[PDB]
Paper text:
An essential function of the [name]:[name] holoenzyme is the control of cell cycle progression through mitosis. Inhibition of [name]:[name] is achieved by the intrinsically disordered proteins ARPP195,6 and FAM122A7. Here, we report the single-particle cryo-electron microscopy structures of [name]:[name] bound to phosphorylated [name] and [name].
Like [name], [name] also binds [name]. This interaction is stabilized by hydrophobic and electrostatic interactions. L96F and I97F bind a hydrophobic pocket, positioning E100F and E104F to bind substrate-coordinating residues R268C/R89C and R214C/R89C, respectively. The E104A variant only modestly weakens [name] inhibition (twofold; as a control, the inhibitory capacity of E106A, a solvent-accessible residue, was not affected). This suggests that interactions at the active site are not essential for [name] inhibition, but instead may be due to interactions, such as those of R105F and V107F, that stabilize the helix across the active site. cBioPortal34 highlighted that [name] R105L, V107G variants are present in different cancers ([name] is a tumour suppressor, as patients with cancer who express low levels of [name] have significantly worse overall survival than those with high levels of expression). [name] R105L and V107G variants showed 11- and 6-fold less inhibition than the wild-type protein, respectively, demonstrating that the probable mode of action of these cancer variants is due to a weaker inhibition of [name]:[name], thereby disrupting [name]:[name] cellular functions. Although both inhibitors use helices to bind [name], these helices project in opposite directions, with [name] helix α4 extending towards the [name] C terminus whereas the [name] inhibitory helix extends towards the [name] hydrophobic groove. The only area of overlap is at the active site itself, where tpS62R projects deeply into the active site, whereas E100F or E104F bind at the periphery.
Residue numbers in the entry:
A (entry chain C): 2 to 298
B (entry chain D): 93 to 111
C (entry chain A): 396 to 589
Amino acid sequence: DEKVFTKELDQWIEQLNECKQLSESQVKSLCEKAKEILTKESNVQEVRCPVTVCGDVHGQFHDLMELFRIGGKSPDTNYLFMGDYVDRGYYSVETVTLLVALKVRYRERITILRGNHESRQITQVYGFYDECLRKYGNANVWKYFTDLFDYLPLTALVDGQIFCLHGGLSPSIDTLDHIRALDRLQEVPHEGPMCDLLWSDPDDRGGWGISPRGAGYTFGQDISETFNHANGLTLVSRAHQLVMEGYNWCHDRNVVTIFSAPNYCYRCGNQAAIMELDDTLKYSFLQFDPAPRRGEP
Amino acid sequence: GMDLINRETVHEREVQTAM
Amino acid sequence: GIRQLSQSLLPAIVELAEDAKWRVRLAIIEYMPLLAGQLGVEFFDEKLNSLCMAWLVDHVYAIREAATSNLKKLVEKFGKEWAHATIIPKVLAMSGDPNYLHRMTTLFCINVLSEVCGQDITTKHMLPTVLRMAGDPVANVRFNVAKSLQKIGPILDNSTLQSEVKPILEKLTQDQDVDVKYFAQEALTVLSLA
Ligand SMILES: [Fe+3]
Ligand SMILES: [Zn+2]
């Protein structure tokens, strides 16, 4: 029955909150059920207010705990994470497992989008593959999660007015219906719409521009204004770029970047932020600093 | 020293260049 | 005599209670029942009660959480009568807050206050608010109502459970949202109402 598993899943969440990894067998079971839930979700996930929107966390588990202390614990607080859950952090395994665990337990209360690091290629360079091998002794867990990443929605739309995605706009995307037409159940391509949605950046330069990252495109203010008007959007909520103050308005408040990993890579010393969307869809921002690390001056 | 963002952007391009 | 220090203590307490770093605000909250006991009820009502209520609506959840438990410790010292006259009517006012996080805070406050305020105060003043909120447009509030009823249900009289609590919980089981249904079912099972 579902009741027995629900209690089992609850135990996992408590265990994961303590920063204790699940076993390989448990992870496999969790991923399987996650896919069944994610496969039903659209490329543009319809999200209801009120919700709290978060940027990258990059395996900084103890700052994810800080995030919940500031914004409130799931399921009481609705959450919308815009990707980049792994790599560049000592606790990517615990970070991704907890967020996947919460999604399975509270599908309606938490939304997790795909970021550019939710990729087989990227995870093998920036540490998530190494961490899984180190913490389990074999690559199976990495295989499971990377397969799961293929099902994560690319974008979310909040009350039909605020459009949330990791990277940014694309020359190949003019209407949200174009996004709904994409096939996302694949490894992140190096080119095209699904690549741009995860890799693009806003820019001061006008119009489209060459991305210094080697992927995606940079887009100016005129692009954002055209896209918002064409789709009836009030705001593009965005991730994927470090900002020192935690959040950064740009393009005449057509776009806002949110970064939720404080003291990024344990060296940037930046502030983290999360955007709380009221019951009235009115937006608010909470800035927070890294959690005091126990036994680490 | 080196700018924080530029450090990550350059290596991201290298990975994407390697493809 | 601490009464002589009171005039010098208050400016320091106010600044700490309003510090920019939320962890600093957390520290002063942990000493509030200690300070309140030393300074007495009369000083607390005039000077410190406003600070405690301001914490309940703090942006940081951790502060609201800490303030919620602060109410129980204050009531444990000043008694039921002071809580009814001073604390309960103000926390219930938050029920109408347009922000669902703040409205849920009311339910959290009732969860801890019921442990001390007793059966009579819970049934007559706190329970009606919980039942009213069952119709909140936000699902998060509604299944917190289910959880709240589950926790304060044992403190209620049996006649109240069958008359008022049971029909509300049964309605919640019909709610469209999955979470509301689940916790509504759990509340009925734990309370042995269905
Ligand atoms: Fe990214
Ligand atoms: Zn990132």
